[PDB]
Amino acid sequence: ALNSAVILAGCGHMDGSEIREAVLVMLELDRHNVNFKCFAPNKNQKQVVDHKKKESVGEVRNILVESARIARGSVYDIEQIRVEEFDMLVIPGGYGVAKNFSNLFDDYILPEFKNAVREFYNAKKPIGAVCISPAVVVALLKDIAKVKVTIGEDSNGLIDKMGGVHVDCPTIKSVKDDVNRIFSCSAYMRNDSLYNVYLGIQDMISSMVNYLK
Amino acid sequence: LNSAVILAGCGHMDGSEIREAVLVMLELDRHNVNFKCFAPNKNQKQVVDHKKKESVGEVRNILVESARIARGSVYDIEQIRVEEFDMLVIPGGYGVAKNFSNLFDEDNDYILPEFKNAVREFYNAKKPIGAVCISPAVVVALLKDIAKVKVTIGELIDKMGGVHVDCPTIKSVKDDVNRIFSCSAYMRNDSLYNVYLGIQDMISSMVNYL
């Protein structure tokens, strides 16, 4: 009987969660008969972005209200998460994850998020992270672990600087840190096709599920 | 092969159904069909807080919100060149009915001309039109005057001027005569993978047809 938490940061790749990554994470959890629950913090987004003009705008949106779009309404305040009810955690990417849960691209990490991910980590429960999310996971774990992830290619040495180890990985595959139970894939870190992005997410969720079995 | 995709916003209660739109795009890509997304440049009729599930007093633009689903690559539907496409798919979402039509309003029957005209162009050119969830009901209504088409919405199509064929979430329906293709998706509270299975069948049918 398998359950996964999914943490969302809004609804959109420029100010929230990457919508395709979130949908594909939920599709593959469901393909594996893993039930899930979505969580988000009840806070304003750092920015709202017009995704057609690709410009920030003077309008305000709540991360949890917007995440309810992706969740079709079934999204819960992250302060309400009971980690014992889940076997694993998946964090889709999107610029909002980095912008809304950290200052690491503006070291601070939104406490309710750090605490949630640390609770999964300290309970030895697999954590999956897509796109930029692996960088945020590395950073929030860096004082207690040096974890291994991919963000695709890291010519700038971001993961090393954040206190982890980077593994180069194609869009269609994923990376497993089998000591720290951290799983990752690169997805829209590259300007690749949706089908290839999906192949990588499919491998990540598979690997997490096989780990629990 | 090239497909148009029409979007009505970003969210199942006031725009396009996000899962349906993403899963349609995944299957087009799967079958190496290129696509372009289109939306009208007009405000949504409502903005719905998807957490409380109530309309709220905010104003959002259909095309700007559709750009979230399209990662930026969405174009004003008034610019659609139908001759550049082999087929059209319309994901569902309550926004497709509420933003493009008065058909589900409390109080004289009407469809947004730029949407009505684009879909008619496809039909009149003998090009497959695929529709998910509530969208087949809107397609039936907009063709009513020139055709009585067969669609599924799973288990109102009579009232709108069409003919309904029952279909499981995991399958799809084809009106071979009128080149209309449909699947039921979130018309039932079914699992996300089951909804996927029917969108997959629909797209595979449209592609296999061509």
PDB file of N, CA and C in Angstrom, chain A residues 11-13 15 18-20 23-24 26-27 30-31 48-52 54 61 65-66 68-73 75 188 193-195 198, chain B residues 10-12 14 17-19 22-23 25-26 29-30 47-51 60 64-65 67-72 74-75 186 191-193 196:
ATOM      1  N   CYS A  11       1.564  27.338 -10.173  1.00  0.00           N
ATOM      2  CA  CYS A  11       1.108  26.657 -11.392  1.00  0.00           C
ATOM      3  C   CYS A  11       1.660  27.354 -12.615  1.00  0.00           C
ATOM      4  N   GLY A  12       2.883  27.022 -12.965  1.00  0.00           N
ATOM      5  CA  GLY A  12       3.585  27.656 -14.099  1.00  0.00           C
ATOM      6  C   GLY A  12       5.091  27.624 -13.973  1.00  0.00           C
ATOM      7  N   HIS A  13       5.794  27.287 -15.058  1.00  0.00           N
ATOM      8  CA  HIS A  13       7.217  27.137 -14.982  1.00  0.00           C
ATOM      9  C   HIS A  13       8.018  28.393 -14.593  1.00  0.00           C
ATOM     10  N   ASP A  15       6.897  30.947 -12.475  1.00  0.00           N
ATOM     11  CA  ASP A  15       6.602  31.499 -11.144  1.00  0.00           C
ATOM     12  C   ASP A  15       6.075  30.518 -10.138  1.00  0.00           C
ATOM     13  N   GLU A  18       6.629  23.643 -12.619  1.00  0.00           N
ATOM     14  CA  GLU A  18       6.564  23.252 -14.033  1.00  0.00           C
ATOM     15  C   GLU A  18       5.379  22.284 -14.168  1.00  0.00           C
ATOM     16  N   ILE A  19       4.406  22.710 -14.920  1.00  0.00           N
ATOM     17  CA  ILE A  19       3.103  22.021 -15.024  1.00  0.00           C
ATOM     18  C   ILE A  19       3.273  20.658 -15.680  1.00  0.00           C
ATOM     19  N   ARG A  20       4.119  20.542 -16.707  1.00  0.00           N
ATOM     20  CA  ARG A  20       4.285  19.258 -17.370  1.00  0.00           C
ATOM     21  C   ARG A  20       4.976  18.264 -16.455  1.00  0.00           C
ATOM     22  N   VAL A  23       2.366  17.132 -13.852  1.00  0.00           N
ATOM     23  CA  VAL A  23       1.394  16.208 -14.405  1.00  0.00           C
ATOM     24  C   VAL A  23       2.046  14.846 -14.644  1.00  0.00           C
ATOM     25  N   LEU A  24       3.281  14.836 -15.171  1.00  0.00           N
ATOM     26  CA  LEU A  24       3.941  13.575 -15.539  1.00  0.00           C
ATOM     27  C   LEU A  24       4.361  12.763 -14.293  1.00  0.00           C
ATOM     28  N   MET A  26       2.581  12.883 -11.471  1.00  0.00           N
ATOM     29  CA  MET A  26       1.308  12.308 -11.004  1.00  0.00           C
ATOM     30  C   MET A  26       0.832  11.141 -11.873  1.00  0.00           C
ATOM     31  N   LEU A  27       1.030  11.228 -13.194  1.00  0.00           N
ATOM     32  CA  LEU A  27       0.696  10.132 -14.127  1.00  0.00           C
ATOM     33  C   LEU A  27       1.485   8.868 -13.792  1.00  0.00           C
ATOM     34  N   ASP A  30       0.590   7.299 -10.484  1.00  0.00           N
ATOM     35  CA  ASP A  30      -0.674   6.578 -10.658  1.00  0.00           C
ATOM     36  C   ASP A  30      -0.494   5.277 -11.488  1.00  0.00           C
ATOM     37  N   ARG A  31       0.394   5.310 -12.477  1.00  0.00           N
ATOM     38  CA  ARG A  31       0.671   4.129 -13.279  1.00  0.00           C
ATOM     39  C   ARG A  31       1.203   2.991 -12.416  1.00  0.00           C
ATOM     40  N   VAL A  48       4.588  37.099  -9.840  1.00  0.00           N
ATOM     41  CA  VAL A  48       3.686  36.536 -10.828  1.00  0.00           C
ATOM     42  C   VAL A  48       4.249  36.887 -12.190  1.00  0.00           C
ATOM     43  N   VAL A  49       4.304  35.924 -13.092  1.00  0.00           N
ATOM     44  CA  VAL A  49       4.820  36.184 -14.411  1.00  0.00           C
ATOM     45  C   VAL A  49       3.763  35.884 -15.508  1.00  0.00           C
ATOM     46  N   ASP A  50       3.618  36.845 -16.420  1.00  0.00           N
ATOM     47  CA  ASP A  50       2.901  36.667 -17.654  1.00  0.00           C
ATOM     48  C   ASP A  50       3.748  35.741 -18.548  1.00  0.00           C
ATOM     49  N   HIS A  51       3.297  34.519 -18.755  1.00  0.00           N
ATOM     50  CA  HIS A  51       4.111  33.527 -19.472  1.00  0.00           C
ATOM     51  C   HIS A  51       4.099  33.705 -21.020  1.00  0.00           C
ATOM     52  N   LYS A  52       3.249  34.563 -21.502  1.00  0.00           N
ATOM     53  CA  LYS A  52       3.263  34.926 -22.943  1.00  0.00           C
ATOM     54  C   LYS A  52       4.309  36.023 -23.200  1.00  0.00           C
ATOM     55  N   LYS A  54       6.512  36.760 -21.036  1.00  0.00           N
ATOM     56  CA  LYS A  54       7.667  36.391 -20.232  1.00  0.00           C
ATOM     57  C   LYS A  54       8.219  37.569 -19.413  1.00  0.00           C
ATOM     58  N   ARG A  61      -0.290  36.411  -6.370  1.00  0.00           N
ATOM     59  CA  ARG A  61      -0.929  35.081  -6.325  1.00  0.00           C
ATOM     60  C   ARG A  61      -0.405  34.245  -5.178  1.00  0.00           C
ATOM     61  N   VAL A  65      -3.354  28.396  -3.462  1.00  0.00           N
ATOM     62  CA  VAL A  65      -4.494  28.584  -4.356  1.00  0.00           C
ATOM     63  C   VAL A  65      -4.138  28.219  -5.786  1.00  0.00           C
ATOM     64  N   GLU A  66      -3.007  28.696  -6.270  1.00  0.00           N
ATOM     65  CA  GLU A  66      -2.570  28.332  -7.626  1.00  0.00           C
ATOM     66  C   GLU A  66      -2.193  26.843  -7.828  1.00  0.00           C
ATOM     67  N   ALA A  68      -3.579  24.449  -6.387  1.00  0.00           N
ATOM     68  CA  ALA A  68      -4.841  23.734  -6.502  1.00  0.00           C
ATOM     69  C   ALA A  68      -5.297  23.514  -7.964  1.00  0.00           C
ATOM     70  N   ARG A  69      -4.803  24.328  -8.912  1.00  0.00           N
ATOM     71  CA  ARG A  69      -5.058  24.090 -10.330  1.00  0.00           C
ATOM     72  C   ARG A  69      -4.458  22.783 -10.764  1.00  0.00           C
ATOM     73  N   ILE A  70      -3.183  22.564 -10.491  1.00  0.00           N
ATOM     74  CA  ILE A  70      -2.507  21.352 -10.840  1.00  0.00           C
ATOM     75  C   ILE A  70      -3.110  20.168 -10.095  1.00  0.00           C
ATOM     76  N   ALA A  71      -3.467  20.395  -8.834  1.00  0.00           N
ATOM     77  CA  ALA A  71      -4.027  19.345  -7.988  1.00  0.00           C
ATOM     78  C   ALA A  71      -5.501  19.095  -8.212  1.00  0.00           C
ATOM     79  N   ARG A  72      -6.145  19.802  -9.150  1.00  0.00           N
ATOM     80  CA  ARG A  72      -7.603  19.710  -9.339  1.00  0.00           C
ATOM     81  C   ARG A  72      -8.319  19.852  -7.970  1.00  0.00           C
ATOM     82  N   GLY A  73      -7.821  20.766  -7.134  1.00  0.00           N
ATOM     83  CA  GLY A  73      -8.496  21.113  -5.878  1.00  0.00           C
ATOM     84  C   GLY A  73      -7.958  20.360  -4.686  1.00  0.00           C
ATOM     85  N   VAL A  75      -5.364  19.939  -2.831  1.00  0.00           N
ATOM     86  CA  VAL A  75      -4.056  20.384  -2.355  1.00  0.00           C
ATOM     87  C   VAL A  75      -4.236  20.826  -0.914  1.00  0.00           C
ATOM     88  N   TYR A 188      13.137  19.805 -17.800  1.00  0.00           N
ATOM     89  CA  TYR A 188      13.245  21.027 -18.589  1.00  0.00           C
ATOM     90  C   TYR A 188      14.451  21.922 -18.232  1.00  0.00           C
ATOM     91  N   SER A 193      12.206  17.846 -25.934  1.00  0.00           N
ATOM     92  CA  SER A 193      10.810  17.520 -26.226  1.00  0.00           C
ATOM     93  C   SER A 193      10.103  16.988 -24.980  1.00  0.00           C
ATOM     94  N   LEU A 194       8.791  17.131 -24.962  1.00  0.00           N
ATOM     95  CA  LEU A 194       7.981  16.648 -23.839  1.00  0.00           C
ATOM     96  C   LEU A 194       8.113  15.143 -23.688  1.00  0.00           C
ATOM     97  N   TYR A 195       8.174  14.421 -24.813  1.00  0.00           N
ATOM     98  CA  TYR A 195       8.253  12.955 -24.704  1.00  0.00           C
ATOM     99  C   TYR A 195       9.571  12.552 -24.011  1.00  0.00           C
ATOM    100  N   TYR A 198       9.460  13.178 -20.369  1.00  0.00           N
ATOM    101  CA  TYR A 198       8.648  12.137 -19.729  1.00  0.00           C
ATOM    102  C   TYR A 198       9.429  10.840 -19.474  1.00  0.00           C
TER     103      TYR A 198
ATOM    104  N   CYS B  10      -5.995  28.079 -17.860  1.00  0.00           N
ATOM    105  CA  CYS B  10      -5.132  27.111 -17.167  1.00  0.00           C
ATOM    106  C   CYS B  10      -5.739  26.649 -15.846  1.00  0.00           C
ATOM    107  N   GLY B  11      -6.611  25.639 -15.891  1.00  0.00           N
ATOM    108  CA  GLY B  11      -7.322  25.131 -14.714  1.00  0.00           C
ATOM    109  C   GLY B  11      -8.680  24.603 -15.111  1.00  0.00           C
ATOM    110  N   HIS B  12      -9.078  23.511 -14.505  1.00  0.00           N
ATOM    111  CA  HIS B  12     -10.246  22.785 -14.954  1.00  0.00           C
ATOM    112  C   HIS B  12     -11.576  23.508 -14.679  1.00  0.00           C
ATOM    113  N   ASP B  14     -11.915  27.045 -14.578  1.00  0.00           N
ATOM    114  CA  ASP B  14     -12.027  28.315 -15.328  1.00  0.00           C
ATOM    115  C   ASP B  14     -11.198  28.440 -16.647  1.00  0.00           C
ATOM    116  N   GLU B  17      -8.399  21.986 -18.911  1.00  0.00           N
ATOM    117  CA  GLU B  17      -8.035  20.958 -17.964  1.00  0.00           C
ATOM    118  C   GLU B  17      -6.559  20.704 -18.193  1.00  0.00           C
ATOM    119  N   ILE B  18      -5.758  20.932 -17.169  1.00  0.00           N
ATOM    120  CA  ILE B  18      -4.302  20.956 -17.322  1.00  0.00           C
ATOM    121  C   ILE B  18      -3.770  19.559 -17.666  1.00  0.00           C
ATOM    122  N   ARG B  19      -4.273  18.527 -16.983  1.00  0.00           N
ATOM    123  CA  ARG B  19      -3.811  17.169 -17.280  1.00  0.00           C
ATOM    124  C   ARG B  19      -4.141  16.731 -18.712  1.00  0.00           C
ATOM    125  N   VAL B  22      -1.788  18.552 -21.148  1.00  0.00           N
ATOM    126  CA  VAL B  22      -0.429  17.980 -21.130  1.00  0.00           C
ATOM    127  C   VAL B  22      -0.354  16.583 -21.766  1.00  0.00           C
ATOM    128  N   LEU B  23      -1.368  15.763 -21.506  1.00  0.00           N
ATOM    129  CA  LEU B  23      -1.399  14.365 -21.977  1.00  0.00           C
ATOM    130  C   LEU B  23      -1.653  14.337 -23.466  1.00  0.00           C
ATOM    131  N   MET B  25      -0.567  16.711 -25.455  1.00  0.00           N
ATOM    132  CA  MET B  25       0.682  17.194 -26.036  1.00  0.00           C
ATOM    133  C   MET B  25       1.717  16.073 -26.053  1.00  0.00           C
ATOM    134  N   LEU B  26       1.677  15.243 -25.012  1.00  0.00           N
ATOM    135  CA  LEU B  26       2.641  14.142 -24.831  1.00  0.00           C
ATOM    136  C   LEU B  26       2.401  13.126 -25.950  1.00  0.00           C
ATOM    137  N   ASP B  29       3.470  14.493 -29.417  1.00  0.00           N
ATOM    138  CA  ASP B  29       4.940  14.299 -29.457  1.00  0.00           C
ATOM    139  C   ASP B  29       5.327  12.831 -29.629  1.00  0.00           C
ATOM    140  N   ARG B  30       4.681  11.960 -28.863  1.00  0.00           N
ATOM    141  CA  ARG B  30       4.859  10.511 -29.000  1.00  0.00           C
ATOM    142  C   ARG B  30       4.752  10.008 -30.452  1.00  0.00           C
ATOM    143  N   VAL B  47     -12.901  33.832 -12.832  1.00  0.00           N
ATOM    144  CA  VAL B  47     -11.689  33.286 -12.292  1.00  0.00           C
ATOM    145  C   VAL B  47     -12.107  32.488 -11.077  1.00  0.00           C
ATOM    146  N   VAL B  48     -11.673  31.228 -10.991  1.00  0.00           N
ATOM    147  CA  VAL B  48     -12.117  30.358  -9.914  1.00  0.00           C
ATOM    148  C   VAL B  48     -10.916  30.013  -9.062  1.00  0.00           C
ATOM    149  N   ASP B  49     -11.030  30.310  -7.757  1.00  0.00           N
ATOM    150  CA  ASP B  49     -10.155  29.797  -6.735  1.00  0.00           C
ATOM    151  C   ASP B  49     -10.368  28.298  -6.638  1.00  0.00           C
ATOM    152  N   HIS B  50      -9.366  27.531  -7.070  1.00  0.00           N
ATOM    153  CA  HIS B  50      -9.475  26.073  -7.198  1.00  0.00           C
ATOM    154  C   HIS B  50      -9.355  25.362  -5.860  1.00  0.00           C
ATOM    155  N   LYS B  51      -8.952  26.077  -4.810  1.00  0.00           N
ATOM    156  CA  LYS B  51      -8.844  25.522  -3.466  1.00  0.00           C
ATOM    157  C   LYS B  51     -10.170  25.631  -2.700  1.00  0.00           C
ATOM    158  N   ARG B  60      -8.655  37.597 -15.279  1.00  0.00           N
ATOM    159  CA  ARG B  60      -7.533  36.954 -15.961  1.00  0.00           C
ATOM    160  C   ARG B  60      -7.784  36.816 -17.460  1.00  0.00           C
ATOM    161  N   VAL B  64      -3.118  34.646 -21.912  1.00  0.00           N
ATOM    162  CA  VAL B  64      -1.980  34.775 -20.989  1.00  0.00           C
ATOM    163  C   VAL B  64      -1.941  33.568 -20.084  1.00  0.00           C
ATOM    164  N   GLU B  65      -3.099  33.131 -19.588  1.00  0.00           N
ATOM    165  CA  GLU B  65      -3.094  31.947 -18.722  1.00  0.00           C
ATOM    166  C   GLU B  65      -2.815  30.657 -19.480  1.00  0.00           C
ATOM    167  N   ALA B  67      -0.803  30.375 -21.759  1.00  0.00           N
ATOM    168  CA  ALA B  67       0.645  30.355 -22.025  1.00  0.00           C
ATOM    169  C   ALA B  67       1.381  29.550 -20.945  1.00  0.00           C
ATOM    170  N   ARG B  68       0.752  29.355 -19.787  1.00  0.00           N
ATOM    171  CA  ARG B  68       1.337  28.523 -18.726  1.00  0.00           C
ATOM    172  C   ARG B  68       1.409  27.082 -19.180  1.00  0.00           C
ATOM    173  N   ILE B  69       0.315  26.573 -19.721  1.00  0.00           N
ATOM    174  CA  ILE B  69       0.281  25.208 -20.264  1.00  0.00           C
ATOM    175  C   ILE B  69       1.247  25.061 -21.446  1.00  0.00           C
ATOM    176  N   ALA B  70       1.335  26.087 -22.270  1.00  0.00           N
ATOM    177  CA  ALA B  70       2.124  26.019 -23.496  1.00  0.00           C
ATOM    178  C   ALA B  70       3.564  26.410 -23.320  1.00  0.00           C
ATOM    179  N   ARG B  71       4.002  26.659 -22.091  1.00  0.00           N
ATOM    180  CA  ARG B  71       5.369  27.149 -21.835  1.00  0.00           C
ATOM    181  C   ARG B  71       5.677  28.356 -22.713  1.00  0.00           C
ATOM    182  N   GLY B  72       4.706  29.258 -22.903  1.00  0.00           N
ATOM    183  CA  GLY B  72       4.951  30.482 -23.686  1.00  0.00           C
ATOM    184  C   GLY B  72       4.513  30.406 -25.138  1.00  0.00           C
ATOM    185  N   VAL B  74       1.967  29.962 -27.230  1.00  0.00           N
ATOM    186  CA  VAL B  74       0.545  29.984 -27.516  1.00  0.00           C
ATOM    187  C   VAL B  74       0.296  31.276 -28.298  1.00  0.00           C
ATOM    188  N   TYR B  75      -0.600  31.198 -29.276  1.00  0.00           N
ATOM    189  CA  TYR B  75      -0.819  32.294 -30.219  1.00  0.00           C
ATOM    190  C   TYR B  75      -2.296  32.639 -30.241  1.00  0.00           C
ATOM    191  N   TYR B 186     -11.925  13.324 -17.781  1.00  0.00           N
ATOM    192  CA  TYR B 186     -12.395  13.746 -16.442  1.00  0.00           C
ATOM    193  C   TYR B 186     -13.897  14.058 -16.346  1.00  0.00           C
ATOM    194  N   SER B 191      -9.086   7.465 -12.431  1.00  0.00           N
ATOM    195  CA  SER B 191      -7.673   7.668 -12.113  1.00  0.00           C
ATOM    196  C   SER B 191      -6.966   8.375 -13.279  1.00  0.00           C
ATOM    197  N   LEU B 192      -5.905   9.122 -12.972  1.00  0.00           N
ATOM    198  CA  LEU B 192      -5.184   9.863 -14.001  1.00  0.00           C
ATOM    199  C   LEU B 192      -4.636   8.950 -15.113  1.00  0.00           C
ATOM    200  N   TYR B 193      -4.165   7.744 -14.767  1.00  0.00           N
ATOM    201  CA  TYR B 193      -3.674   6.825 -15.786  1.00  0.00           C
ATOM    202  C   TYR B 193      -4.815   6.297 -16.685  1.00  0.00           C
ATOM    203  N   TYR B 196      -5.554   9.069 -19.124  1.00  0.00           N
ATOM    204  CA  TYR B 196      -4.476   8.960 -20.099  1.00  0.00           C
ATOM    205  C   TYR B 196      -4.715   7.877 -21.155  1.00  0.00           C
TER     206      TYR B 196
END
